[PDB]
Design a binder for this molecule. Sequence first.
Ligand code: 7GI
Length: 297
Amino acid sequence: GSGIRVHHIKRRDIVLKWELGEGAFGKVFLAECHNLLPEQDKMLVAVKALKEASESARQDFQREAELLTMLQHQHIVRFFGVCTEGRPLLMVFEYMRHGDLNRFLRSHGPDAKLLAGGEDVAPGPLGLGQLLAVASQVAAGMVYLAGLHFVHRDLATRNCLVGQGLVVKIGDFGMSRDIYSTDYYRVGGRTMLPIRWMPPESILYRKFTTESDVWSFGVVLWEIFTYGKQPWYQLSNTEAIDCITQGRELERPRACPPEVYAIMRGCWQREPQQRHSIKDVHARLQALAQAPPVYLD
Ligand SMILES: C[C@H]1CNC(=O)c2cnn3ccc(nc23)N[C@H](C)c2cc(F)ccc2O1
């Protein structure tokens, strides 16, 4: 009985257009939703399918739907509601035209193998003030979630989305999409963690706290200032564990001013208690975004 009213959607108002992608045993479609909300009579959305419909996965779904319904913020991808009328079970979010932040970073790389346009952003390397803008918006999401003592255990550019005008929001939480993803380390069976993003207290004592998140967010900045590079890409899953645990730190990115590296280094304090409040990290990134310091070669 007692719970959050989750907006349910008729299958007739949902027209699947094509696969955007496929992960977490749940394909993601572009689709058109008719009369979802009165402002637009027909409107574009992303939709998460479910590959399995077992009663211990329909439970996963109701929790996710409930939790998603409450977690409403500027920098968290709008959730419109679900659809259980037919089968496969559907979840419906706003469409983010630039897809996941990690791809988007790699495609505004210098290393980028081809040029990617769009009407709302220059091709080629992004303005430091934009890089910071991105960071700033992820930090605004993280702050909200810390607000509700929510802990995202997989903070990474891969789990963020980029929309019209370079709006950046948090887009995924649980149920890791790519099962053959190289960022995740297989520890049991059906148990994989994004080691490279994880702080020592998490690899060692398997403890995850808003501080663990802050740590993880420092790596997100690193990813953001490397146009989506995999942290410790030269190393192996065990080598990275060694590095993190020994206390080795990620090098400064070439593109990365020392004022930001500084922020990163305060996210990576070995003492969880000695890591900067996310709120303070957000503040400084917002400030820096407002007046981007100059920095060459
Ligand atoms: C299929 C990929 C790409 N998604 C979209 O391009 C895409 C565009 N808009 N949008 C909305 C939700 C959504 N994907 C998209 N959810 C999925 C599960 C998702 C979330 C992420 F944080 C990152 C990637 C991702 O799915």
